């Protein structure tokens, strides 16, 4: 379970690169292309299938981090249109972060924000390159 593994990360008992940050699998065989942390092959398969899929509202269908989610926050940046589920945000940014972001208006997401690091959520400095290779 992702919850406990992230706990360990915060406790500096485990490196975030050694966990799948999308599902919590320990069978990491590759790097998450957008954020610092590991990724399992299942989630890669999910990512390849779900990434940049869009709903009829003009925003992405699934959480950028986990390619899933039930309630998601949508980026206001029209050049972006990404979304992030409440669970990944509270888990990786930190407890309360989702509620904090929901009250923000306008809200620009973690793939837009210049700071690039939000709690344990760290955007890769080279994610376009990573992405491009992820896809190939």
């Amino acid at each position: 379970s992702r919850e406990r593994l992230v706990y360990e990360v915060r406790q500096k008992c485990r490196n975030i690169e050694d966990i799948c940050i999308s599902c919590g699998s320990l069978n990491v065989t590759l790097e998450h292309p957008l954020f610092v942390g590991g990724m399992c092959q299942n989630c890669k398969n999910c990512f390849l299938e779900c990434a940049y899929q869009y709903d009829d509202d003009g925003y992405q269908s699934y959480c950028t981090i986990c390619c899933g989610g039930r309630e998601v926050l949508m980026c206001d940046n029209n050049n972006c249109c990404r979304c992030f589920c409440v669970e990944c945000v509270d888990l990786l940014v930190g407890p309360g972060a989702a509620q904090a972001a929901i009250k923000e208006d306008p809200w620009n997401c973690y793939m837009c924000g210049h700071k690039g690091t939000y709690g344990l959520l760290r955007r890769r400095e080279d994610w376009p390159s990573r992405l491009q290779m992820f896809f190939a």
Partner: peptide, 7 residues
């Protein structure tokens, strides 16, 4: 932030 429930 706007929110929605995922499909």
């Amino acid at each position: 932030a706007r929110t929605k429930q995922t499909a």
